[PDB]
Design a protein around this ligand. Structure first.
Ligand SMILES: Cn1cnc(C[C@H](N)C(=O)O)c1
Length: 330
C-alpha cells in the first residue's frame, strides 16, 4: 500500500501545514497538523468543551459505525510552545491520502489550550515521531505510521513542504520526480523518541562552511529553525540592525533588510535555505521590525530543524529497523 496527501499552509507565513484526513464510517474529514515531533493523533470532537471550540471541524464518534471507545484510556500532552490538550480515546478507521489503517487510536479532546482554540484552521494533530512518546495511559498507543508500516510498500514517509505553497506527504514510497540530485541519508537516534540526527555544520550566506556537529530533531510541527546561540549569533551578525529582543521573544531585524541564506550540512551534502524563507514579517501589523526565522535553542534544550529548514528539502523519514533521515534538494 501507499498514500499521498497534499499539505497546505494555514496562513501567509507558513506557520503550520494542514493535511486532510478521513476518520470513521462514513468518512469525517478533518484537517490535521502532521507533526514529526510528537506521537499522538488527537482531534477536536463532540466531547471538546464547547467554549474551547471556535470554528474547528469536530470528529463525532457516535456518527461513526466503526468507532469504539477504548475503555479506560486517557491522554494528556504538552508541547514545546506551552500548548496542551487532553481527553479520552476511540479506535476507528483512519485514511490518509488513500492509505487506510483500521483500529487506529483517535484521541478525542475534552480540553484544549487557548492557542488551539484560536487556530480555527487546525482540527487536531497527527503525530509521526516514535510511538514511545505516545501519551495514552494505561496502554500506550501506536502512531498512524507505525500501524501502517505492515501494509506499506516500503517503511517510509516523506515530507515535501512548500514555501508559500502546498506540498505533499507520501507514505510507503519515494517519489523520484519530487527532488533533484541524490538523497543523502544520515543516522537517526530514537533514544529520545524523536527523528534525532546530527548535522555536519553550517554556512551563513556566501561565507565559508563551518564543520561542527549539531544534534537536533526533524520536526514538521515546529515553524522555525532553532539552533545553538553561537550559530544564530553568527547568522544575525550579517544583518544590519538585527538584535535579540527580550520584549518580542527572539531575534528581530529591520524589515528593510535583505536576509542572507543559511546552509546546513547533511553528511557531505548541503541544504540551502533561501534568505526569503527566514523572513517572518512584521512583529505586529504595520511594524517596521520583522521577526526572524532562525532563533536560539538555548532556552529549549534541543535544536529543532522545523519547517523553515525542512521546506528547503525533500525529506525522507525512513522507519526501517535501522531508521535514517534523507535530505535532497528540490
Ligand atoms: C501542537 N504543537 C506541536 N509542535 C508545536 C510547536 C510549535 N508549532 C512551535 O513552532 O513552537 C506545537
Amino acid at each position: 500500500s501507499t498514500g499521498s496527501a497534499t499539505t497546505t499552509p494555514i496562513d501567509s507565513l507558513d506557520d503550520a501545514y494542514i493535511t486532510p484526513v478521513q476518520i470513521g464510517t462514513p468518512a469525517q474529514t478533518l484537517n490535521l497538523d502532521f507533526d514529526t515531533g510528537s506521537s499522538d493523533l488527537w482531534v477536536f470532537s463532540s466531547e471538546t468543551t464547547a467554549s474551547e471550540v471556535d470554528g474547528q471541524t469536530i470528529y463525532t464518534p457516535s456518527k461513526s459505525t466503526t468507532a469504539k471507545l477504548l475503555s479506560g484510556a486517557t491522554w494528556s500532552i504538552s508541547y514545546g510552545d506551552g500548548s496542551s490538550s487532553s481527553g479520552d480515546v476511540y479506535t476507528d478507521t483512519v485514511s490518509v491520502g488513500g492509505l487506510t489503517v483500521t483500529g487506529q487510536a483517535v484521541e478525542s479532546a475534552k480540553k484544549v489550550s487557548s492557542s488551539f482554540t484560536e487556530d480555527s484552521t487546525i482540527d487536531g494533530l497527527l503525530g509521526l515521531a516514535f510511538s514511545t512518546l505516545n501519551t495514552v495511559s494505561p496502554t500506550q498507543q501506536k502512531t498512524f505510521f507505525d500501524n501502517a508500516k505492515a501494509s506499506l510498500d516500503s517503511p517510509v514517509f516523506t515530507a515535501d513542504l512548500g514555501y508559500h505553497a502546498p506540498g505533499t506527504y507520501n507514505f510507503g514510497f519515494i517519489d523520484t520526480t519530487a527532488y533533484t540530485g541524490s538523497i543523502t541519508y544520515t543516522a537517526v537516534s530514537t533514544k529520545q523518541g524523536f527523528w534525532e540526527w546530527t548535522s555536519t555544520g553550517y554556512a551563513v550566506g556566501s561565507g565559508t562552511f563551518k564543520s561542527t556537529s549539531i544534534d537536533g530533531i526533524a520536526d514538521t510541527g515546529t515553524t522555525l529553525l532553532y539552533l545553538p546561540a553561537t550559530v544564530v549569533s553568527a547568522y544575525w551578525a550579517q544583518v544590519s540592525g538585527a538584535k535579540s529582543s527580550s520584549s518580542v521573544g527572539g531575534y528581530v531585524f529591520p524589515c528593510s533588510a535583505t536576509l542572507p541564506s543559511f546552509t546546513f550540512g547533511v553528511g557531505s551534502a548541503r541544504i540551502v535555505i533561501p534568505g526569503d524563507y527566514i523572513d517572518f514579517g512584521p512583529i505586529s501589523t504595520g511594524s517596521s521590525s520583522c521577526f526572524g526565522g532562525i532563533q536560539s535553542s538555548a532556552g529549549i534544550g534541543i535544536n529543532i530543524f522545523g519547517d523553515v529548514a525542512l521546506k528547503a528539502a525533500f525529506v525522507v523519514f525512513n522507519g526501517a529497523t535501522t531508521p535514517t533521515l534523507g535530505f535532497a534538494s528540490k
